[PDB]
Amino acid sequence: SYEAPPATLEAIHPKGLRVSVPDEGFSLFAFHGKLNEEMEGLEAGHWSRDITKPKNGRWIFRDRNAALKIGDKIYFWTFVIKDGLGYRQDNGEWTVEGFVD
């Protein structure tokens, strides 16, 4: 049965974090994440935000001010509502390996 799609994360040059999932017929996408500190289960995170509509096919979370560095780790989990039911990407871990213009 259904599983949340994996998120794509990008570090932006000169600054910023962008996180997105494809719209698979959701009503809601939430991102919950911490920088260089593990998530202790389903805690809110330093980044914690509900996104309520997709934009051109994707659900997008942005922190335009996040100044990331190579080797920074983001520990995260996401939440999507599909047909009134909730699904998570659990135990997300992403390492900055480069930047996007």
Ligand X SMILES: OC[C@H]1O[C@@H](O[C@@H]2[C@@H](O)[C@H](O[C@@H]3[C@@H](O)[C@H](O[C@@H]4[C@@H](O)[C@H](O[C@@H]5[C@@H](O)[C@H](O[C@@H]6[C@@H](O)[C@H](O)O[C@H](CO)[C@H]6O)O[C@H](CO)[C@H]5O)O[C@H](CO)[C@H]4O)O[C@H](CO)[C@H]3O)O[C@H](CO)[C@H]2O)[C@H](O)[C@@H](O)[C@@H]1O
Length of the chain: 101
Question: Torsion over CA of 53, 38, 2 and 54, rounded to 10 degrees?
Answer: 10
Q: Report, in Å, the least distance between residue 93 CB and ligand X.
A: 18
Q: Report, in Å, the least distance between residue 92 CB and ligand X.
A: 13
76 annotated as belonging to a binding site for a ligand: no
Q: Nearest residue by C-beta to ligand X?
A: 30
Q: Report, in Å, the least distance between residue 86 CB and ligand X.
A: 6
79 annotated as belonging to a binding site for a ligand: yes
Q: Which two tokens stand for residue 61?
A: 């979370």
Burial 58-78 (b: 16+ CB within 10 A, else e): ebbbbbeebebeeebebbbbb
- Binding interface with ligand X (CB under 6 A): 28, 30, 42, 50, 79, 86, 88
The smaller minimum CB distance to ligand X, of residues 37 and 50, is found at: 50
